[PDB]
């Protein structure tokens, strides 16, 4: 079971320094943004990372939320990434959740993070280029040192 500890404002970037954002169709996308662009698109680029206590510790348990039309929380339900209209809850009864990800620092860096699905072991949050768009997806670790599943969390310490 999970218990909410705190919620903090953060900006998420891939290894190309492209910042994670919610577009008009509520799609989690990645694009090149200066500190100016990032500031002008603030409700769509500022994410709420909520930290949870876990009765079965196996990585920093987190939810990822954003304020658009309403508070939306990131879900990997049926191994598909989407933002569902809900607040990060105070308590989660199971040992697995479609909105709970395990945040881990990549041994290569103190900056680089990875987000593994609690409900789908071996599946990670990833940036994948589809046509001319950089999309937030859920995938199995394709290879060792895969940069597509690595991110930076800017919470300014």
Author numbering: 1 to 157
The authors write:
Interleukin (IL)-18 belongs to the IL-1 superfamily and was first discovered as an interferon gamma (IFN-γ)-inducing factor in sera from mice with hepatitis stimulated with Propionibacterium acnes and lipopolysaccharide1. This proinflammatory cytokine is secreted by various types of cells and strongly augments IFN-γ production in type-1 helper T (Th1) cells and natural killer (NK) cells following activation of NK-cell cytotoxicity; thus, it plays a critical role in inflammation and the host defense against microbes. IL-18/IL-18Rα/IL-18Rβ ternary complex formation juxtaposes the intracellular Toll-Interleukin-1 receptor domains of IL-18Rα and IL-18Rβ, to which the adaptor molecule myeloid differentiation factor 88 (MyD88) is recruited presumably with the aid of TRAM6. We determined the crystal structures of IL-18, the IL-18/IL-18Rα binary complex and the IL-18/IL-18Rα/IL-18Rβ signalling ternary complex at the resolutions 2.33, 3.10 and 3.10 Å, respectively.
The IL-18 structure essentially does not change on complex formation, maintaining the β-trefoil fold that comprises 12 β-strands (β1-β12) and 2 α-helices (α1-α2), as previously reported. In addition, two isomeric forms that originate from a cis or trans peptide bond between Ala42IL-18-Pro43IL-18 in the loop are equally populated in the solution structure. The flexible nature of the segment produces a variety of architectures, as demonstrated in several crystallographic reports, including a loop with a trans isomer22, an α-helix with a cis isomer21 or, primarily, unobservable flexible loop with a trans isomer2022.
